């Protein structure tokens, strides 16, 4: 199929792009490069084994969106583009609402204009809010995210839902992601955060690589087995695969298809650390720090639905997630070149 | 003070503009005229007894907003501008999200740019969602509005809240309106809906004026005293006054000030009809019809908070609401001139 991948050059997008090309689809990448580099492009094509078309631009530019859509005869759109730093969203709410809410709004409006009716949105587990009921299931009513980032994702899911209701021919998938980690097995592609990494994995990686001193373990008094926070870590390649399957099986299938994308099991901070220590061949330095504001104690996804309906489930393990990360971190200490 | 009134030429805005001028404030009206006419302008100035400056434009145009803000040295902004047809919002969700959510976003972004930090937003009782607890109180957590319109209002309240948190010097009032009716005592200003009126009052008016046959009473089996739906009707002049007081007392007072704006009592459909029959000197034709989709049975506001904190309460009665409407309807059967 002909697919437009917004945010195609970022972490999740790049991996998804490779899988898509491998599946022989025609890929058009639209990215504004605020959080990625042109350097990834050649890697995508190499790994993907096919040439993806790249367009530098902003999802906020409806006129350009509309033009791309038409110009390439897009069939479906995968929307990864936006801002995701939680803490920063609290400090700069407007930018989040603008990039995420208005950003998606301008894109779907362009779609309407070009007669494109298949969409895939990068959502998040955050939309469940403070849910005591774990694992999280798609049948659960949504809650209230505590950050402008989380709120922005829920607001878009709502806007998409309403849009589908009004234009019932649309196929819209709301993919709720859990905690994406890992990198391409090649070790030539991976997450390349600028500055201080906000997520656990990259931070660990940066400690291991010798860039950082010690990993600060946000709270050790949680009501978990080991006292550290528990999450659902999902390999970026598994995530990418799920994106290809969702796209292929859902295209032209009217409705709003919500699916949690996770491993369906929880791992603590200690578990992750240990896995990385193992991967990198040296104990990862760490210390216990106070709980991070807004952090829930433990949650993971109930991924039965995606298994059942799309025959999708993860295949990579936690160890692989850590190994692949170390391999990329180690092979490209400076990430993507400028 | 120097105030920018978006949507200044519409129903609520025009009345508010008069009261503001009467209070000697300097008024700048910004309206795109999608739901109002330039004809109202001279009425505003006449009734207001002062000249308001008018600018034709769109809240969506951030650059223009920014320019107005600076250009007139605005101190505070009253934001009435947006779309409000509930049923239509269900049919055209994108337009609602765009005008309301993006629309406000572009405006507050312009404010930030021009260093304006006092805001008044036209919110709605709809934000409480399906609340069995009546009357509705500001301390109640918000619910989930069932239309894109309702959702759009809640989304903006959330975005404003987050913004205030990030820029704590801002004063933001979230004015939750109940059911606005009535018109200026002069009978020379009032609500001028185009096409089929969606609200009860105007519809009644149009039946009385001889434009419409019979009023369709949406459901007569509700669990109310008379079986018809019960609401909190609030005279547009009371509403306008509350806007002046809120603006004057809240300016430069940091925080998010939420206030319900209603009479604090409920009236049924029958009650309203009767009041209008009385006002117009002839029985208003009506019939019973099935319940309207999404209609709640009964609710009204708990307006104690505004009384206490701003010393504001309504002063007009239901009869006056009906009389003033009939007077305007009758004196200007064709509304504002083209
Ligand atoms: N990484 C996670 O932990 C996490 C968890 C849940 C959801 N998500 C969502 O998944 C998506 C992909 O995230 P990611 O980890 O790949 O992050 P990322 O930053 O690597 O990818 C986002 C990409 O979007 C681009 N972009 C940003 N705003 C843009 C705009 N207005 N116009 C055009 N391009 C724009 C960035 O330059 C970047 O290349 C995002 O929507 C993110 O919110 C990720
Ligand atoms: N009337 C009600 O029953 C009701 C109840 C709750 C909330 N509200 C809110 O109060 C506000 C005022 O409502 P109203 O009854 O006066 O309606 P209205 O339609 O008379 O007033 C809105 C005005 O905004 C203008 N406008 C619309 N979109 C615009 C845009 N993008 N840029 C610039 N101008 C724009 C319209 O032309 C109109 O003059 C609205 O935000 C409405 O949502 C009203
Ligand atoms: O330096 C660090 C970083 C993280 N953690 C802990 O590690 C766990 C994972 O934290 P993190 O990588 O930041 O991800 P999450 O907060 O769990 O990610 C959630 O939030 C993302 C952004 O909101 C998406 O919504 C995902 O779906 C969601 O599961 C948590 O228990 C953190 O307390 C630390 O102890 N130290
Ligand atoms: O032709 C009509 C019109 C209305 N009604 C009834 O009259 C009452 C009032 O209806 P309406 O004027 O449409 O206003 P509301 O739906 O009550 O207004 C609510 O919704 C507005 C738009 O959402 C704002 O949120 C207000 O705060 C809020 O109280 C309801 O019981 C309706 O069922 C009829 O029976 N026939
Ligand atoms: Na801050
Ligand atoms: Na960064
Ligand atoms: Na680098
Ligand atoms: Na429809
Ligand atoms: Na109309
Ligand atoms: Na007219």
Describe the protein in words:
Chains A, B: Substrate binds at residues 124, 149, 179, 199-200, 216-218, 231, 292-295, 299. Chains A, B: This is UDP-glucose 4-epimerase. Chains A, B: Its EC number is 5.1.3.2. Chains A, B: Involved in the metabolism of galactose. Catalyzes the conversion of UDP-galactose (UDP-Gal) to UDP-glucose (UDP-Glc) through a mechanism involving the transient reduction of NAD. It is only active on UDP-galactose and UDP-glucose. Chains A, B: The active site is at residue 149. It is classed as epimerase. 2 copies of one chain form a homodimer. The first copy, chain A, is 40% helix and 17% strand. Chain A contains 11 helices and 13 strands. Chain A has 338 residues and is α/β, with parallel strands linked by helices. Chain A has helices at 11-22, 40-48, 62-71, 86-91, 93-114, 148-166, 200-208, 236-250, 269-280, 304-310, 318-331, and strands at 2-6, 26-31, 53-56, 76-79, 118-124, 171-177, 179-181, 215-218, 230-231, 233-235, 255-261, 267-268, 286-289. The first copy, chain A, is globular and about 55 Å long. In chain A, helix 1 (11-22) links the parallel strand 1 (2-6) and strand 2 (26-31). In chain A, the strands form 4 sheets. In chain A, strands 3-2-1-4-5-6-11 form a 7-stranded parallel β-sheet, with helices on both faces. In chain A, strands 7-10 form a two-stranded parallel sheet. Chain A has 2 domains: 182-231 and 263-338, UDP-galactose 4-epimerase, domain 1 (Alpha-Beta Complex); 1-181 and 232-262, Rossmann fold (3-Layer(aba) Sandwich). One uridine-5'-diphosphate-glucose binds at residues 86, 124-126, 149-150, 177-179, 198-200, 203, 216-218, 229, 231, 269, 292, 295 of chain B.
């Amino acid at each position: 199929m002909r697919v437009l991948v917004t945010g195609g050059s970022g972490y999740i997008g790049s991996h998804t792009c490779v899988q898509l090309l491998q599946n022989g689809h025609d890929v058009i990448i639209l990215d504004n490069l605020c959080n990625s580099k042109r350097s990834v492009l050649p890697v995508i094509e190499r790994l993907g084994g096919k040439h993806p078309t790249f367009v530098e631009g902003d999802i906020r530019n409806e006129a350009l969106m509309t033009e791309i859509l038409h110009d390439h005869a897009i069939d479906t759109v995968i929307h990864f583009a936006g801002l995701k730093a939680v803490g920063e969203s609290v400090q700069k709410p407007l930018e989040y609402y603008d990039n995420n809410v208005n950003g998606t709004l301008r894109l779907i409006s362009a779609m309407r204009a070009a007669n494109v009716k298949n969409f895939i949105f990068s959502s998040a587990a955050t939309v469940y809010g403070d849910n005591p009921k774990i694992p999280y299931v798609e049948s659960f009513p949504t809650g209230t995210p505590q950050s402008p980032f989380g709120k922005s994702k829920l607001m878009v899911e709502q806007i998409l839902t309403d849009l589908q209701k009004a234009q019932p021919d649309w196929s819209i998938a709301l993919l709720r992601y859990f905690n994406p980690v890992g990198a391409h097995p090649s070790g030539d592609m991976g997450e390349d955060p600028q500055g201080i990494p906000n997520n656990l994995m990259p931070y660990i990686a940066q400690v291991a690589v010798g860039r950082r001193d010690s990993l600060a373990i946000f709270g050790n008094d949680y009501p978990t087995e080991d006292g550290t926070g528990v999450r659902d870590y999902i390999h970026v390649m598994d995530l990418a695969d799920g994106h290809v399957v969702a796209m292929e099986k859902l295209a032209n299938k009217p409705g709003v298809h919500i699916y949690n994308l996770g491993a369906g099991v929880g791992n603590s901070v200690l578990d992750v650390v240990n896995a990385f220590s193992k991967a990198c061949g040296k104990p990862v330095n760490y210390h216990f720090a106070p709980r991070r504001e807004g952090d829930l104690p433990a949650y993971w996804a109930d991924a039965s639905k995606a298994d059942r309906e799309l025959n999708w489930r993860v295949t990579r393990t936690l160890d692989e997630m850590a190994q692949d990360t170390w391999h990329w971190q180690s092979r490209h200490p400076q990430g993507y070149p400028d």
